[PDB]
Amino acid sequence: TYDALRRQLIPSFDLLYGSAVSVVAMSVPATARILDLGAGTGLLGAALRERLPDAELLLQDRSQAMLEQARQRFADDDQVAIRVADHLDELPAGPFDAVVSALSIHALEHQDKQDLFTRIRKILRPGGIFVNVEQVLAPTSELEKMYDRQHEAHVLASDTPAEEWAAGRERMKHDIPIDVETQIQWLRDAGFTTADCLAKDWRFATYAGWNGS
Ligand SMILES: Nc1ncnc2c1ncn2[C@@H]1O[C@H](CSCC[C@H](N)C(=O)O)[C@@H](O)[C@H]1O
Ligand SMILES: [Ca+2]
Numbered sequence: 001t002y003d004a005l006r007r008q009l010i011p012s013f014d015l016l017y018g019s020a021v022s023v024v025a026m027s028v029p030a031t032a033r034i035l036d037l038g039a040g041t042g043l044l045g046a047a048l049r050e051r052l053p054d055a056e057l058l059l060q061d062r063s064q065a066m067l068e069q070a071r072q073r074f075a076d077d078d079q080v081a082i083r084v085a086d087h088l089d090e091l092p093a094g095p096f097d098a099v100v101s102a103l104s105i106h107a108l109e110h111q112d113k114q115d116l117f118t119r120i121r122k123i124l125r126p127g128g129i130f131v132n133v134e135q136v137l138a139p140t141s142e143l144e145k146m147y148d149r150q151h152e153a154h155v156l157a158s159d160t161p162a163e164e165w166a167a168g169r170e171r172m173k174h175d176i177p178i179d180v181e182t183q184i185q186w187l188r189d190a191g192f193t194t195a196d197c198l199a200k201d202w203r204f205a206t207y208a209g210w211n212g213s
């Protein structure tokens with residue numbers, strides 16, 4: 001229902017979230033310790049749990065209301081913990097095999113994104129992976145209009161309730177997105193040895209940084 005609405009609002013939901021799960025599964029052991037940053041209702045954590053039954057998940061968000069949905073989703077899961085913290089607050093010490101995030105970090109000022117990527121690398125073990133499923137800006141105003149048309153085309157094709165799309169539009173006014181290549185370069189600046197865009201559908205992209213490989 002909520003998960004159905006996220007699929008209606010997010011072009012290539014299965015490709016982009018699935019790419020995040022696949023790249024983690026190919027980068028970390030079965031028993032990986034994983035931080036889901038801005039976990040919300042725990043959708044990305046849930047996708048990872050489906051693939052990695054033995055992974056320890058820490059779901060972190062500033063919103064207790066969002067994390068209540070995550071607590072309900074993971075009620076019977078003894079390998080899931082929840083932390084209430086802002087991206088800008090001290091991160092959990094870990095170390096972590098993976099730090100993942102979906103549709104959260106684009107809320108931060110650009111300087112705070114650059115600092116967050118560096119702070120994430122500090123809590124990753126050597127060879128650890130950072131993955132972001134992200135809302136990204138087009139590199140030009142003209143291309144941004146085309147990105148917007150492609151997003152609207154998906155929303156309309158998915159028979160999204162008009163009020164939910166209106167609410168989606170209102171939330172996006174507060175967003176501080178940047179182009180995918182700029183923020184992938186920020187991973188290199190943060191000291192990740194490899195950074196790559198795995199999958200992309202115009203405004204939405206899955207990218208990753210590796211802490212040594
Ligand atoms: N500065 C910040 N610190 C922590 N969480 C933040 C944040 N800004 C936004 N968030 C959280 O980021 C989430 C964005 S919605 C995405 C939720 C989830 N990752 C999913 O894929 O469905 C919300 O849960 C919101 O509370
Ligand atoms: Ca948003």
Ligand code: NA
Nearest residue numbers: 064067068071
């Ligand atoms: Na709760």
